[PDB]
Design an enzyme around this catalytic site. Structure first.
Site, PDB file in Angstrom:
ATOM      1  N   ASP A   1       0.779  -1.243   0.000  1.00  0.00           N
ATOM      2  CA  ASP A   1       0.000   0.000   0.000  1.00  0.00           C
ATOM      3  C   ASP A   1       0.802   1.279   0.000  1.00  0.00           C
ATOM      4  OD1 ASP A   1      -2.506  -1.037  -0.302  1.00  0.00           O
ATOM      5  OD2 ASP A   1      -3.155  -0.683   1.769  1.00  0.00           O
TER       6      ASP A   1
ATOM      7  N   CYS B   1      -1.757   0.885 -13.402  1.00  0.00           N
ATOM      8  CA  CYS B   1      -2.032   0.812 -11.984  1.00  0.00           C
ATOM      9  C   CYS B   1      -3.327   1.587 -11.703  1.00  0.00           C
ATOM     10  CB  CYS B   1      -0.841   1.300 -11.167  1.00  0.00           C
ATOM     11  SG  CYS B   1      -0.130   2.868 -11.729  1.00  0.00           S
ATOM     12  N   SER B   2      -3.386   2.387 -10.644  1.00  0.00           N
ATOM     13  CA  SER B   2      -4.580   3.230 -10.455  1.00  0.00           C
ATOM     14  C   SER B   2      -4.553   4.451 -11.373  1.00  0.00           C
ATOM     15  CB  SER B   2      -4.748   3.657  -9.000  1.00  0.00           C
ATOM     16  OG  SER B   2      -5.988   4.342  -8.834  1.00  0.00           O
ATOM     17  N   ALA B   3      -3.405   5.105 -11.428  1.00  0.00           N
ATOM     18  CA  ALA B   3      -3.272   6.333 -12.198  1.00  0.00           C
ATOM     19  C   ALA B   3      -2.409   6.199 -13.447  1.00  0.00           C
ATOM     20  CB  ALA B   3      -2.723   7.436 -11.345  1.00  0.00           C
ATOM     21  N   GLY B   4      -1.683   5.090 -13.599  1.00  0.00           N
ATOM     22  CA  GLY B   4      -0.715   4.966 -14.685  1.00  0.00           C
ATOM     23  C   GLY B   4       0.507   5.815 -14.404  1.00  0.00           C
TER      24      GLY B   4
ATOM     25  N   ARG C   1       4.062   2.812 -10.260  1.00  0.00           N
ATOM     26  CA  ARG C   1       4.137   1.361 -10.328  1.00  0.00           C
ATOM     27  C   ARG C   1       4.252   0.896 -11.788  1.00  0.00           C
ATOM     28  NH1 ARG C   1      -0.757  -0.588  -6.329  1.00  0.00           N
ATOM     29  NH2 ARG C   1      -0.054   0.514  -4.429  1.00  0.00           N
TER      30      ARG C   1
ATOM     31  N   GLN D   1       8.194   7.214  -9.948  1.00  0.00           N
ATOM     32  CA  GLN D   1       7.676   8.418  -9.331  1.00  0.00           C
ATOM     33  C   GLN D   1       8.282   8.692  -7.949  1.00  0.00           C
ATOM     34  OE1 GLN D   1       3.371   7.859  -8.815  1.00  0.00           O
ATOM     35  NE2 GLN D   1       3.303  10.082  -8.501  1.00  0.00           N
TER      36      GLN D   1
END
Ligand SMILES: [Cl-]
Ligand SMILES: [Cl-]
Length: 290
Positions: A190, A224-227, A230, A268
Site C-alpha cells: 500500500d 495501476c490506479s493512475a498509470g 508502479r 515516481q
C-alpha cells in the site's frame, strides 16, 4: 544540458550502486533529481478540456497531448499514453485504472490498438480507497461492453498474481476475434515497493515470456490506479532486464529518462528508483557466480 543516460559496466555495477547509496543515498538522490523535469515541458491541454474531466480518475494525472492514445469517432479522449520501443513505435500503452464510466472506452482502445496483453499492478481497493473498477467479467458469462463482446475463458489465481484469459470481438479490422491475456499483480504494498526484488523480476520475466511467444502481441497495456509510478517501474524493469540479457552495460537512468519523456510520473519515487537498482544488483550478483 542534463544527462539522458548513465550506463554502468556490469562488472562495476555492485560498486556503483554502493557508492550511490553512501552517505544516506547522497549521490543516488542527486542522480534521481536530475530526472525531475524530464518530459515536463509538455502540455496536457486536451486531457484538461471541460468535456474530459469525468474520463480522468485523477484530474491532475493526465496524458501529454503529444503521446496520448486516441479512440476512433467523435470523442477521442482516453487517459492513456503510448510508449515507443527500441525497434518500433507503440511497444506499450500506459493507462489509468478504468472507471465505471470509462471501462467501455478501455476495451475499445484494447480492440482498436490490437492489444493482446494487459498488465495490472494495482488492486481494485487499497487501504479502503477505490483504485480501479473491476472492469472485466466476474465469471464466464459473456457480456457486451459498448460495441464489443467479452467472455472470460479462464481465471488462475497464483500466489502473487492472477492470470485471466478473455475472448474479445469488436468491429473487424486486422482481426475478427481475439484472445486477451491479463496479468494481475495482486500484492504491491500500500505505500512502498514490493518486499522482494525476486517477485517483480519474476513477474516481469513471466509476462515478457508470454509476450514473446505470441505470434503477434500488439502494444502491451500496463496500468495501476493512475498509470504512474508502479506502471513505470514495471516497464523500466522490463527494459532493464532485457538490457542485462543483451549488453555488458546497464542504464537504469536512461530507461527511466526514456519513460518520463512520454508520460508524467513514470517511476515516481526515489524508493522505486532504488528498487530498480536492487533488482539489477541481485541479478548481477547471481550471474557473477554462475
Ligand atoms: Cl510510440
Ligand atoms: Cl520495439
Amino acid at each position: 544540458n542534463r544527462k539522458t543516460s548513465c550506463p554502468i559496466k556490469i562488472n562495476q555495477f555492485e560498486g556503483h550502486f554502493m557508492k550511490l547509496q553512501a552517505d544516506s543515498n547522497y549521490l543516488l538522490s542527486k542522480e534521481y533529481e536530475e530526472l525531475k523535469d524530464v518530459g515536463r515541458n509538455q502540455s496536457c491541454d486536451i486531457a484538461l478540456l471541460p468535456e474530459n474531466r469525468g474520463k480522468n480518475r485523477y484530474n491532475n494525472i493526465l496524458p501529454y497531448d503529444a503521446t496520448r492514445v486516441k479512440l476512433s469517432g467523435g470523442s477521442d479522449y482516453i487517459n492513456a499514453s503510448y510508449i515507443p520501443g527500441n525497434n518500433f513505435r507503440r511497444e506499450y500503452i500506459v493507462t489509468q485504472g478504468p472507471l465505471p464510466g470509462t471501462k467501455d472506452d478501455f476495451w475499445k482502445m484494447v480492440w482498436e490498438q490490437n492489444v493482446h496483453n494487459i498488465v495490472m499492478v494495482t488492486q481494485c481497493v487499497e487501504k479502503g480507497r477505490v483504485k480501479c473498477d473491476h472492469y472485466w467479467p466476474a465469471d464466464q458469462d459473456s457480456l457486451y461492453y459498448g460495441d464489443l463482446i467479452l467472455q472470460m475463458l479462464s481465471e488462475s489465481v497464483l500466489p502473487e498474481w492472477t492470470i485471466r484469459e478473455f475472448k474479445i470481438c469488436g468491429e473487424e479490422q486486422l482481426d475478427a476475434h481475439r484472445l486477451i491475456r491479463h496479468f494481475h499483480y495482486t500484492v504491491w504494498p500500500d505505500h512502498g515497493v514490493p518486499e522482494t526484488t525476486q517477485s517483480l523480476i519474476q513477474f516481469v520475466r513471466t509476462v515478457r515470456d508470454y509476450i514473446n511467444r505470441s505470434p503477434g502481441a500488439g502494444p502491451t497495456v500496463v496500468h495501476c490506479s493512475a498509470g504512474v509510478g508502479r506502471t513505470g517501474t514495471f516497464i523500466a524493469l522490463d527494459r532493464i532486464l532485457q538490457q542485462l540479457d543483451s549488453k555488458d552495460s546497464v542504464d537504469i537512468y536512461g530507461a527511466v529518462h526514456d519513460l518520463r519523456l512520454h508520460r508524467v510520473h513514470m517511476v515516481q519515487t526515489e524508493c522505486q528508483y532504488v528498487y530498480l537498482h536492487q533488482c539489477v544488483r541481485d541479478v548481477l550478483r547471481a550471474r557473477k557466480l554462475r
